[PDB]
Amino acid sequence: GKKVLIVYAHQEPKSFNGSLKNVAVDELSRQGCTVTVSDLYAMNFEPRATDKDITGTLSNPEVFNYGVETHEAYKQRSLASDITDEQKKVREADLVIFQFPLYWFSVPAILKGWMDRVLCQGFAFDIPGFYDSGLLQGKLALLSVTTGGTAEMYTKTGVNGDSRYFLWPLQHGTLHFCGFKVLAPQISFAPEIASEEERKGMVAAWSQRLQTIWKEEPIPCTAHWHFG
Amino acid sequence: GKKVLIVYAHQEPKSFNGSLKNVAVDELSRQGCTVTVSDLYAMNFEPRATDKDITGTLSNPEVFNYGVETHEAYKQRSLASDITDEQKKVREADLVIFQFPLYWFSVPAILKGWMDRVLCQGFAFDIPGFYDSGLLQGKLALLSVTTGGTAEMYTKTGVNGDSRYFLWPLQHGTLHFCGFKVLAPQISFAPEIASEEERKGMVAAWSQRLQTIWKEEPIPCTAHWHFG
Numbered sequence: 094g095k096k097v098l099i100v101y102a103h104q105e106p107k108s109f110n111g112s113l114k115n116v117a118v119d120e121l122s123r124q125g126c127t128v129t130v131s132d133l134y135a136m137n138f139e140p141r142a143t144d145k146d147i148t149g150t151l152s153n154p155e156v157f158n159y160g161v162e163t164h165e166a167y168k169q170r171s172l173a174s175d176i177t178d179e180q181k182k183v184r185e186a187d188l189v190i191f192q193f194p195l196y197w198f199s200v201p202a203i204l205k206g207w208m209d210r211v212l213c214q215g216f217a218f219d220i221p222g223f224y225d226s227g228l229l230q231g232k233l234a235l236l237s238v239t240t241g242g243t244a245e246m247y248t249k250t251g252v253n254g255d256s257r258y259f260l261w262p263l264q265h266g267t268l269h270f271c272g273f274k275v276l277a278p279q280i281s282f283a284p285e286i287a288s289e290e291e292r293k294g295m296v297a298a299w300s301q302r303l304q305t306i307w308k309e310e311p312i313p314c315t316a317h318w319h320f321g
Numbered sequence: 322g323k324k325v326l327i328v329y330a331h332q333e334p335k336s337f338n339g340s341l342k343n344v345a346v347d348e349l350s351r352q353g354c355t356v357t358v359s360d361l362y363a364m365n366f367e368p369r370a371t372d373k374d375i376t377g378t379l380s381n382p383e384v385f386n387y388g389v390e391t392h393e394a395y396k397q398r399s400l401a402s403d404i405t406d407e408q409k410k411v412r413e414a415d416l417v418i419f420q421f422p423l424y425w426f427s428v429p430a431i432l433k434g435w436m437d438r439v440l441c442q443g444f445a446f447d448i449p450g451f452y453d454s455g456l457l458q459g460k461l462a463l464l465s466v467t468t469g470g471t472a473e474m475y476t477k478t479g480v481n482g483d484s485r486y487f488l489w490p491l492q493h494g495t496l497h498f499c500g501f502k503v504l505a506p507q508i509s510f511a512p513e514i515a516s517e518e519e520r521k522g523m524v525a526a527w528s529q530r531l532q533t534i535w536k537e538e539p540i541p542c543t544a545h546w547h548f549g
């Protein structure tokens with residue numbers, strides 16, 4: 094019996110993003126999976142990487158190096174509880190779904206801050222200890238992204254480039270780096286411009302894909318997949 | 322005369338980023354330029370895109386849509402003042418320099434939230450009015466980035482892929498989108514690994530480049546430049 098974490102980054106429960114999150118919960122629930130949702134905005138999740146992320150006393154109180162300090166806090170069980178709460182959710186999950194609108198060819202800052210502060214060295218990766226040596230191997234990850242731009246725009250010769258090109262930092266630089274196998278992204282192009290019925294189709298595509306998510310092989314998370 | 326804004330995203334004044342920011346201020350100062358720095362961590366800059374960013378009557382109080390509400394608020398002058406404060410700095414600047422450490426093949430969340438909240442519709446772009454018709458046309462922008470990974474790792478055949486691939490969402494999807502011309506990036510690779518003379522070299526290389534910044538031409542911020 095499979096365990097899923099949804100990390101959800103939208104301000105509005107009635108949004109397209111909210112509905113994608115809610116049918117994921119509905120469908121994965123119906124299947125009998127264990128489901129957990131991190132509703133970042135509702136949590137007022139802190140995005141900033143600061144010295145407040147370490148409790149007690151610093152490994153080097155004179156010069157603050159966030160990566161060093163968080164690595165030695167993880168090893169010594171002195172990370173801030175908001176971090177470690179999320180790390181627990183990840184540790185337990187077989188699959189991590191990220192549900193977000195595209196902000197500047199990336200994730201909204203609040204979700205960027207989740208990646209920055211939750212995926213610390215010792216938990217997600219070490220230096221050295223990354224990519225296939227990353228610490229979240231055996232887990233699946235999946236980006237479920239909504240865009241303002243059309244599919245059209247997201248082509249190699251289109252104004253925005255191929256959508257793969259913006260996935261690189263997220264899928265490869267982040268999710269692969271950490272050991273994840275990367276399920277094929279779910280991209281919901283341009284719902285604010287789509288008709289009701291097209292929107293319904295995209296939600297149902299997502300509901301249906303979700304019926305057979307566990308039968309999926311990861312994408313090959315390569316430069317060639319993304320650029321060639 | 323020329324006017325520079327440095328948007329700086331590092332927690333530690335004694336860091337390698339801190340040194341790069343200060344040599345920029347020193348050199349650009351020496352040349353007679355007008356220089357302004359937004360030290361985001363020191364400002365406790367808010368990264369989250371929330372309904373707190375609009376103080377006036379919302380256009381749809383039942384269903385919150387951050388893009389629609391911020392676009393309206395900018396036109397009516399009911400955005401949060403922290404946003405407006407940054408927009409004034411950008412509007413005055415001839416050149417915007419971003420100084421940051423690479424976090425997950427991207428900017429630190431606090432700086433992502435600057436992008437998200439400061440570059441709103443009406444101020445930075447319109448629909449229509451983006452890419453070469455973006456509202457910040459006539460301005461220059463430059464990413465000054467530091468990394469953990471070495472240069473070799475950031476090559477087409479190295480584990481990270483070429484350095485330009487991770488620049489795409491920044492340079493193209495954000496800066497060119499808003500009309501900026503983009504000067505070639507300054508990438509200071511792996512300062513932590515480097516020797517102290519090589520670190521000094523990197524600082525001084527940046528200072529030296531800034532001597533002739535105003536004579537540079539922008540890159541052609543296309544898919545071909547980034548991906549080949």
Ligand SMILES: Cc1cc2nc3c(=O)[nH]c(=O)nc-3n(C[C@H](O)[C@H](O)[C@H](O)COP(=O)(O)OP(=O)(O)OC[C@H]3O[C@@H](n4cnc5c(N)ncnc54)[C@H](O)[C@@H]3O)c2cc1C
Nearest residue numbers: 108109110112194195196197198239240241242285292388
């Ligand atoms: C800071 C910022 C940066 C941005 N940067 C980019 C960028 O780089 N690239 C880009 O392409 N876009 C960008 N965008 C736009 C953003 O990606 C899209 O606006 C977002 O993806 C749309 O998703 P949403 O959930 O808010 O849509 P919504 O507007 O909330 O939903 C679209 C419509 O679907 C309806 N809907 C909701 N649930 C259902 C349902 N169950 N069935 C049918 N219809 C339903 C809603 O009611 C609504 O009418 C940016 C936006 C912001 C604010």
Ligand SMILES: Cc1cc2nc3c(=O)[nH]c(=O)nc-3n(C[C@H](O)[C@H](O)[C@H](O)COP(=O)(O)OP(=O)(O)OC[C@H]3O[C@@H](n4cnc5c(N)ncnc54)[C@H](O)[C@@H]3O)c2cc1C
Nearest residue numbers: 160336337338340422423424425426467468469470513520
């Ligand atoms: C959340 C997170 C995610 C990351 N993701 C990535 C990623 O995707 N890819 C990647 O490659 N890296 C990544 N890193 C690594 C990060 O990019 C590097 O740690 C960072 O760029 C190093 O810069 P710094 O200023 O912090 O270095 P510092 O550690 O501050 O500097 C290195 C040394 O230079 C010294 N120094 C300072 N000023 C000078 C001077 N004037 N002359 C000589 N020496 C000087 C310092 O004192 C120090 O000893 C990540 C780190 C974190 C925390």
Ligand SMILES: COc1ccc2[nH]cc(CCNC(C)=O)c2c1
Nearest residue numbers: 160161214220266270425469470
């Ligand atoms: C994809 O390369 C990455 C990804 C995440 C990372 N975090 C950290 C490093 C290197 C140095 N360590 C710190 C300071 O965190 C790093 C490299």
Ligand SMILES: COc1ccc2[nH]cc(CCNC(C)=O)c2c1
Nearest residue numbers: 197198241242243388448494498
């Ligand atoms: C880099 O693309 C971006 C960046 C910021 C943005 N904010 C809102 C949108 C949607 C714009 N809608 C269309 C179809 O043009 C948007 C796109």
Ligand SMILES: [Zn+2]
Nearest residue numbers: 265269314315
């Ligand atoms: Zn990969």
Ligand SMILES: [Zn+2]
Nearest residue numbers: 493497542543
């Ligand atoms: Zn471009």
